């Protein structure tokens, strides 16, 4: 707590630095995110995995705002202090660098809450930020920031009341008490559903992510892709399965349904795009249905499959947007008909393009294989055809993933040269840590 | 000893595509590849006669526990068992001479290292493949092989139809991949474990059985998943002889063999139709390719009907993939020869005469195809025969259409093997030009596929060699008088005038041109309907004007 | 550097102090009803540091009182900035040999974004209204007037630039050379006689530069006789 | 064009109008792909009747 | 024939410079206006949408029929799963008061 205080004092001094040191203000606010990094860690250093659920806790006082760690925020939080240094080596203003400081605070905050007026509070402040971010004057798309802002403002206010229904029902928001007394079931659950099924994309309220994640720049897009979507999945995993099992044993079917049609509706849409970031956008809601399905099984260890698919794509998919970010700021277009023989004329960005497909296709050797074989037994032990659905699917993920694959990197060689330094290690993170992860990646 | 032959192809596949080959070159890369094969060769011999002659399985615990959630346990562990020692002499033995060809096939080639490299990671996948011990360690060799053969059919990436060969391959694969998982889900959930020692299976659901045949089936390339296995000739010569050989085409028939969890009618169904439709496929091809690339799916039908027939049917069904790999490699490295003597030219029609080629390529296609067609005493004529006699007398009714359609299959296979043989030496010839090969290198791997082919005779697979299986003389001796009516009627060289049935064969019954509208054009629209009816319609909120 | 941390700390807590100060010291005016603070005289400044880094000047050069020399400049000895002369240092560093003249308004500086330091060697003639941008100068050279000299430009010993010339960015002037030309290009060699009167050139400067510094003082002490 | 006369011009179109396909033989077609690529559906359908059938079996004849 | 740095380092912009300076847009596609137009117009294909004969049939079949399958289906694995597993019949959602939630000091 005294820790994060200092953290957050530290990164806010980008704003006082004269603009005139231009070295200075990219070192710092480069180091304001490293920190974190190293205090997380840390923190999983101190973890104690034979001891209790919730570990390293502290509330403050009568304010809401209490904090504590387990697993699945853990290893959320790695992922996200890994992922903004790479969003800090893609900017170029400070305007950019205090955006996502503050981002970065509001997402790692939100992660460790243990009360839910206080995740309301700390998750949806970044609205006008995301807004901001995504509607930037000369290449940004304003139509896709107010979609994005006001999605997650209707799920948000159908939230609210709930919220305070269950406040006045029990006489706290505290999840530890929430979850131990009886309280009416079917509103608050309808509440949780409504905006958990809009930040994780769920069919019909999922039209937001075609637009936003693609209008936003390199460092928005490995932001949203990797980490924003994964509130939702903690949403379910820490507040409503706990708070309200009645109504998530019977809105199964409902749920159940909007997996299956958001994973085969967005899969054939993925099929016929054009749009090489449209491509990658879309590939994230069949992976982000498959998690949610596994959540609401609650079936063999459904808790840790889900959270390691979490991980997986959080680690894979930010890598594709990289190396289509890299192709959009050397040759500023993201159409397919303008590139072809990019093996040839880069060949470190075609592999890499091609090891990163193949672990968005749950490739072995890649933790995305790991995750959805665990994901599938989650899914399996309830019903075998719930899984049979997802198997025999997978001919139609392949299908966009090697035809954009082979369209773009094969044939007549046109396009950028070769990667730099600075973009071959944007990248690099990614890779360790998913041949770690889909190698060894327990002991 | 038991290590250096799965890890060391993988170490030379890593050498040859890493930074490391920037400073060997072409030249130090051929060397290169060509040791870290001999050496793995060199071990998997040891396993060999350690295992199948003196019975001792050994268990290696190689890098600790891969993942282990609740009851889900999966290691990085091999067992080198009997299966395993046979299909580790065989795939070894077989990428040694074609590594040993395809550093002089491939000399011209731009980037020769990163073709080498490409074939040694092949060989170490199909190594782990047949070398794990539990399911999960099986799916890191079906994967990769499958991502190896993507890397090696479209390898001339510049060529559009290789490129979309390359593609297809993936596609029809990534199906029965579907299924196989399906599949090792009910065999986990229904025996709690993933070990093939502790799956030992008596009477189980049905989709068991079903989707693990399914899944074979795919990389297998029977009935309505051969599509693939045509258009995969695509790729250079070495890449079609290793698949066809050794890796990829015989991972399903493995699998099978040892989980001996099927259900009769399905296999012995699918293994005699598939073997049939491959015969008559054969018989209309002028693509020198693809006739040999047709009869390798026409004995993967006459494998899957053995381990259809039982236990004693399993073992047969190893020792025909085992000498199979031998002569079908030699087969494809004779053809990549007479191509290369004749200009590139793959047609049939443009061949004749014994000017293109060396005296070593005509020996070891005429060699290779006396064992395929199963010429008596030789290393196809055992097994074969074997299989034959063992559906002649199965008490299941069904086997006995199963029976009739592998007899006229093996008239099919004599008639357009002699033909293969007739018009690229006998006949007058009919192309221009004459470049014959007398290299070496491929000379050489044409002769260890030779030498495989006479200790296949000599030493047999299994226990079943000289077994005799009582059958009447009239039973017993209408295979060799099928294959003689085979070449008789190939060297008369006579054709019929009913020219549909000619061109409906010929054109291998449409079924490339059926699948493109029956699944993929409806999976194109449905896409259509899904983004702009859904996405852009129904679902779509517009904004209020003011 | 966290020498450079230190001398942060100090001059911000000085500059703070000052303002208080400065602030105190005008409520007090107002206390008396005298408004003299409220004066728009002309608050030019001779000398003008930047934060830490002051101009270092030697005790026999002269700056004149309408020139000025801001951030980090180095004053060589014997040497002169004129009337109206700027000289910045502020961004990068100015660095001026001995015997060297910087004539009246003209411009020397490295405020560009990637220019790198002003270096100027000895017995070196800066024209009138001549503008140079991150240039290094050698010795024994006439700058000629109104020219301008870009960036990371070389400008060797013995070299003349004539009058209103242009030499482009990156160039390298090699030595005993005329140069002319907006789009500047070599004209000849220099002469003999020519070099004689270059070489006599920055002697007179320096007794010019004698003179005016005591007119400067003779006017200093009549302006303190108005205040003391 | 400098090669137009050794593999052949850019003056043959192609013949194709890049329409959808007929509203029947697309809903034919995807209900022929329903029954062949989801056939364990329809499998445990049957037996789940085939079930409940002999349960009713059971029940009518037992009372009586 | 640019020259963008000096020998000892040193990047130069080159404002003034005669020489064409490479840079970052250096590889920048010269873009085809049909393709422009047709990236353009799918870009915004909402304005296409219109409730003809053919978009309202299979929007119909395909949207909804899929949609009533998948609930079926969910509906029949829930119940066969809740049968298989000791249970009686339980509460969906609009199924009148019944058994959730199984109890684990109780054995079904
Ligand atoms: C394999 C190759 C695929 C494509 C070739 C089609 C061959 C089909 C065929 O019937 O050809 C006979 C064909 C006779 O056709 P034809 O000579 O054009 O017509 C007969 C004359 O007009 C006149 O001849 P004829 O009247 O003197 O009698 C010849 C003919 C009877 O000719 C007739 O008059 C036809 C009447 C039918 C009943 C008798 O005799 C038979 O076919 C009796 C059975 C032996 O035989 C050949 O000359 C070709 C020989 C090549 C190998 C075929 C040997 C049989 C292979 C058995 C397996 C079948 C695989 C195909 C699966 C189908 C899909
Ligand atoms: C009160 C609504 C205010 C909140 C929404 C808002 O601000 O809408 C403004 C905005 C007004 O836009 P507009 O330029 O006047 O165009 C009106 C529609 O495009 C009208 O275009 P349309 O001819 O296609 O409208 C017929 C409409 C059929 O309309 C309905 O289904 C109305 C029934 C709604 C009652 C709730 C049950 O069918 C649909 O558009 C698809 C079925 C809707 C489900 O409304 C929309 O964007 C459409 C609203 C449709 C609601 C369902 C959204 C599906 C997700
Ligand atoms: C070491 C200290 C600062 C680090 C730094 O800049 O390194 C300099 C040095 C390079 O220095 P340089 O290249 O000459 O440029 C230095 C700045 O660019 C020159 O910047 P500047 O002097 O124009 O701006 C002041 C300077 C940092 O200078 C300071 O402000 C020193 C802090 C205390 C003095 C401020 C008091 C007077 C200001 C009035 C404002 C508030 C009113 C207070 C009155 C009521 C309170 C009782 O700001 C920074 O550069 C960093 C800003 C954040 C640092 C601390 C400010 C946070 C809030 C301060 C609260 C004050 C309340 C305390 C009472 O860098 C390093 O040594 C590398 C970093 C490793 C150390
Ligand atoms: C719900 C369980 C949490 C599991 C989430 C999945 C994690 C993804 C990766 C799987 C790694 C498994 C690690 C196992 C051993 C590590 C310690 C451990 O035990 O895990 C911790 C938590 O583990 C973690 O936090 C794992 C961190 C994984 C995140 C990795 C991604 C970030 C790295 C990015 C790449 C960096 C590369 C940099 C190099 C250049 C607690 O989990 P449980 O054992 O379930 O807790 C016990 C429960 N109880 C106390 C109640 C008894
Ligand atoms: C110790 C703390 C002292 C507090 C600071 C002093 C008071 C704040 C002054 C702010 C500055 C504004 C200003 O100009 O001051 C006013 C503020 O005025 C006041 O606050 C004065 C109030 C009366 C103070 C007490 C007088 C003596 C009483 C004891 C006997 C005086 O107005 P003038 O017109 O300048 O004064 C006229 C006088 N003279 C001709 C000399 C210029
Ligand atoms: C309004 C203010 C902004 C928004 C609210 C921010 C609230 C503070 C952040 C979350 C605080 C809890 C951190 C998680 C944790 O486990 O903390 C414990 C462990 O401490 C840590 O190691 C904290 C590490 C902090 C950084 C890790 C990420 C968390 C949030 C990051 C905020 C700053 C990020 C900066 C990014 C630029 C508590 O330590 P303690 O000694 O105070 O508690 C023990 C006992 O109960 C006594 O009270
Ligand atoms: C333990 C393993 C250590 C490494 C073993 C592998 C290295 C042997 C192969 C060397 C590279 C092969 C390419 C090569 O040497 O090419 C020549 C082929 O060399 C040969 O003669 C064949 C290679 C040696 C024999 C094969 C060795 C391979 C090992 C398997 C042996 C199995 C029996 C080309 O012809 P030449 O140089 O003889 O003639 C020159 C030409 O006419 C004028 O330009
Ligand atoms: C882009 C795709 C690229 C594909 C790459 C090829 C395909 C790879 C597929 C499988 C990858 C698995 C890699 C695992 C890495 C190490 C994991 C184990 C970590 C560890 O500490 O284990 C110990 C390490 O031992 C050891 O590692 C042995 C000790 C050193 C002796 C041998 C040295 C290795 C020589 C290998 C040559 C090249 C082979 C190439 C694969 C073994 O002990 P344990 O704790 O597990 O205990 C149990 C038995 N004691
Ligand atoms: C001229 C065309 C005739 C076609 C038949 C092939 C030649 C067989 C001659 C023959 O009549 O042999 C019979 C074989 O029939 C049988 O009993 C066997 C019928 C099936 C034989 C088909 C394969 C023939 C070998 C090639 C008698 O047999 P036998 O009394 O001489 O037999 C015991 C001595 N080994």
Request: net charge neutral.
């Amino acid at each position: 707590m005294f820790i994060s205080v200092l953290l957050i004092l530290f990164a806010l001094c980008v704003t006082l630095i004269p603009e005139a040191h231009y070295h200075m203000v990219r070192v710092w606010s480069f180091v304001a995110t490293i920190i974190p990094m190293w205090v997380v860690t840390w923190m999983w250093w101190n973890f104690d995995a034979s001891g209790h659920g919730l570990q390293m806790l502290v509330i403050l006082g009568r304010s809401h705002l209490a904090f504590g760690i387990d697993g699945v925020a853990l290893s959320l939080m790695l992922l996200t202090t890994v992922l903004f240094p790479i969003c800090m080596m893609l900017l170029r203003t400070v305007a950019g660098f205090m955006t996502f400081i503050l981002l970065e605070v509001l997402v790692l905050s939100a992660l460790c809450v243990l009360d839910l007026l206080g995740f309301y509070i700390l998750f949806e402040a970044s609205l006008i930020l995301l807004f901001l971010l995504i509607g930037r004057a000369p290449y940004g798309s304003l139509e896709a920031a107010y979609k994005i802002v006001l999605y997650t403002m209707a799920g948000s206010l159908v939230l609210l009341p709930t919220l305070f229904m269950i406040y006045s029902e029990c006489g706290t928001t505290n999840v530890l008490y929430m979850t131990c007394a009886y309280n009416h079931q079917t509103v608050l659950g309808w509440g949780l559903l409504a905006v958990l099924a809009v930040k994780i994309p769920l069919m019909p309220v999922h039209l937001w992510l075609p637009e936003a994640h693609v209008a936003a720049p390199t460092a928005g897009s490995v932001l949203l892709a990797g980490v924003l979507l994964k509130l939702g999945g903690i949403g379910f995993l820490r507040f409503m399965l706990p708070v309200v099992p009645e109504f998530c044993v019977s809105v199964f079917p409902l749920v159940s349904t909007l997996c299956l049609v958001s994973f085969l509706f967005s899969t054939l849409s993925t099929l016929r795009q054009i749009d090489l970031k449209k491509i990658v956008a879309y590939s994230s809601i069949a992976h982000m249905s498959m998690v949610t399905l596994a959540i609401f099984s609650q079936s063999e260890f459904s808790a840790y499959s889900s959270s390691f698919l979490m991980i997986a794509h959080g680690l894979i998919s930010p890598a594709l947007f990289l190396i289509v970010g890299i192709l959009y700021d050397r040759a500023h277009t993201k159409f397919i008909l303008y590139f072809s023989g990019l093996g040839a004329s880069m060949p470190i960005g075609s592999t890499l393009f091609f090891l990163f497909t193949l672990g968005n296709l749950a490739f072995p050797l890649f933790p995305n294989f790991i995750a959805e074989v665990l994901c599938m037994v989650s899914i399996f032990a309830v019903h075998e055809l719930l899984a049979y659905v997802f198997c025999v699917c997978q001919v139609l993920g392949a299908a966009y993933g090697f035809w954009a694959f082979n369209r773009v990197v094969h044939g007549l060689p046109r396009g950028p040269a070769d990667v730099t330094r600075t973009e071959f290690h944007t990248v690099l993170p990614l890779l360790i840590g998913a041949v770690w992860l889909g190698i060894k990646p327990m002991a | 000893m038991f290590l250096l032959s799965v890890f060391f192809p993988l170490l030379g596949g890593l050498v040859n595509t890493s930074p490391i080959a920037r400073f060997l070159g072409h030249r130090g890369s051929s060397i290169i590849a060509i040791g870290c094969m001999v050496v793995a060769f060199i071990s998997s011999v040891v396993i060999y006669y350690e295992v199948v002659f003196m019975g001792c399985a050994v268990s290696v615990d190689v890098f600790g526990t891969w993942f282990s959630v609740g009851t889900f346990h999966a290691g990085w562990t091999f067992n080198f068992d009997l299966l395993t020692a046979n299909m580790l002499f065989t795939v070894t033995g077989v990428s040694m001479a074609v590594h040993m060809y395809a550093c002089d096939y491939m000399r011209q080639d731009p980037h020769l290292n990163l073709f080498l490299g490409y074939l040694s990671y092949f060989t170490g996948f199909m190594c782990v493949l047949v070398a794990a011990d539990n399911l999960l360690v099986m799916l890191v060799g079906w994967e990769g092989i499958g991502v190896c053969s993507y890397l090696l059919i479209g390898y001339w990436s510049h060529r559009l139809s290789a490129v979309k060969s390359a593609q297809k391959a993936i596609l029809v694969n990534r199906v029965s991949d579907g299924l196989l998982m399906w599949g090792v889900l009910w065999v986990w959930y229904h025996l709690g474990s993933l070990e093939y020692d502790l799956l030992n299976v008596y009477s189980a659901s049905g989709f068991v059985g079903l989707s693990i045949l399914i899944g074979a089936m795919g990389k297998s390339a029977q009935i309505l998943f051969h599509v693939w296995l045509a258009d995969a000739m695509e790729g250079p010569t070495p890449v079609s002889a290793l698949i066809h050989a050794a890796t990829l085409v015989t991972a399903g028939v493995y699998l099978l063999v040892r989980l001996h969890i099927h259900d009769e009618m399905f296999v012995i169904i699918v293994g005699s139709l598939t073997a049939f439709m491959a015969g008559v496929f054969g018989a209309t091809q002028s693509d020198l390719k693809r006739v040999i690339a047709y009869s390798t799916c026409s004995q993967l039908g006459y494998m899957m009907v053995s381990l259809g027939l039982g236990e004693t049917g399993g073992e047969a069904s190893m020792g025909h993939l085992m000498t199979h790999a031998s002569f079908k490699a030699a087969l494809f490295l004779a053809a990549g020869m007479v191509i290369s003597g004749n200009g590139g030219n793959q047609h049939i029609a443009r061949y004749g005469g014994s000017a293109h080629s060396a005296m070593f390529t005509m020996l070891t296609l005429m060699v290779a195809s006396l064992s395929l067609i199963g010429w008596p005493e030789l290393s196809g004529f055992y097994s074969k025969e074997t299989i034959l006699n063992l559906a002649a007398i199965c008490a299941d009714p069904i086997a006995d259409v199963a029976h009739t359609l592998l007899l006229l299959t093996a008239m099919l296979t004599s008639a357009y093997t002699t033909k293969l043989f007739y018009q690229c030496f006998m006949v007058d010839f009919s192309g221009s030009s004459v470049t014959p090969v007398r290299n070496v290198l491929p000379i050489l791997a044409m002769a260890i596929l030779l030498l495989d082919i006479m200790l296949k005779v000599w030493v047999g697979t299994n226990l079943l060699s000289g077994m005799l299986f009582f059958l009447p003389w009239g039973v017993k001796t209408l295979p060799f008088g099928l294959m003689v009516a085979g070449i008789l009627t190939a060297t008369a060289a006579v054709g019929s005038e009913r020219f549909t049935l000619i061109r409906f064969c010929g054109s291998r019954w449409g079924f490339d041109q059926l699948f493109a509208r029956s699944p993929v054009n409806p999976i194109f629209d449905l896409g259509r309907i899904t983004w702009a009816i859904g996405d852009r319609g129904l679902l779509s909120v517009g904004n209020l004007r003011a | 550097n966290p020498i450079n941390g230190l001398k942060t700390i100090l001059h911000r807590v000085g500059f703070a102090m000052r303002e208080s100060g400065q602030a105190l010291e005008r409520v007090g005016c107002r206390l008396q009803g005298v408004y003299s603070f409220e004066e728009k005289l002309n608050r030019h400044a001779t000398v003008l540091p930047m934060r830490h880094n002051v101009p270092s000047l030697d005790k026999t050069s002269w700056v004149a009182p309408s020139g000025m020399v801001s951030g980090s400049v180095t004053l060589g000895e014997n040497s002169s900035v004129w009337y109206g002369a700027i000289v910045r240092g502020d961004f990068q560093p100015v660095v001026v040999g001995s015997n060297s003249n910087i004539q009246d308004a003209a411009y020397v500086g490295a405020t560009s974004e990637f220019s790198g330091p002003v270096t100027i060697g000895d017995n070196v003639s800066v024209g009138h209204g001549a503008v140079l941008k991150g240039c290094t100068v050698g010795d024994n050279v006439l700058i000629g007037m109104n020219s301008i000299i870009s960036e990371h430009a070389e400008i060797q010993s013995g070299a003349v630039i004539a009058a209103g010339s242009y030499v482009e960015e990156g160039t390298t002037v090699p030595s005993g050379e005329v140069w002319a030309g907006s789009p500047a290009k070599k004209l000849r060699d220099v002469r003999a006689g020519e070099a004689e009167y270059l070489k006599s050139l920055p002697g007179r400067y320096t007794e010019l530069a004698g003179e005016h510094k005591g007119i400067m003082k003779v006017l200093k002490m009549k302006q303190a006789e108005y205040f003391a | 064009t400098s090669l137009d006369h050794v593999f052949g011009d850019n003056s043959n179109k192609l013949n194709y109008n890049f329409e959808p396909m007929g509203m029947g033989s697309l809903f034919i077609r995807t209900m022929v792909m329903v029954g062949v690529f989801f056939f364990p559906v329809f499998i445990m359908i049957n037996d789940d009747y085939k079930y409940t059938s002999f349960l009713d079996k059971v029940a009518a004849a037992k009372a009586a | 024939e640019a020259k963008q740095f000096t020998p000892d380092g040193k990047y130069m912009p080159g404002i003034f410079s005669k020489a064409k300076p490479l840079d970052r847009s250096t590889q920048w596609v010269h873009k085809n206006p049909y393709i422009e137009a047709w990236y353009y117009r799918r870009d915004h294909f909402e304005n296409e949408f219109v409730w003809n004969y053919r978009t309202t049939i299979e929007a119909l079949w395909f949207l909804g029929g899929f949609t009533a399958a998948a609930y079926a289906l969910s509906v029949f694995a829930f119940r066969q799963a809740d049968r298989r597993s000791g249970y009686p019949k339980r509460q969906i959602l609009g199924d009148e008061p019944a058994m959730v939630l199984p109890d684990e000091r109780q054995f079904y």
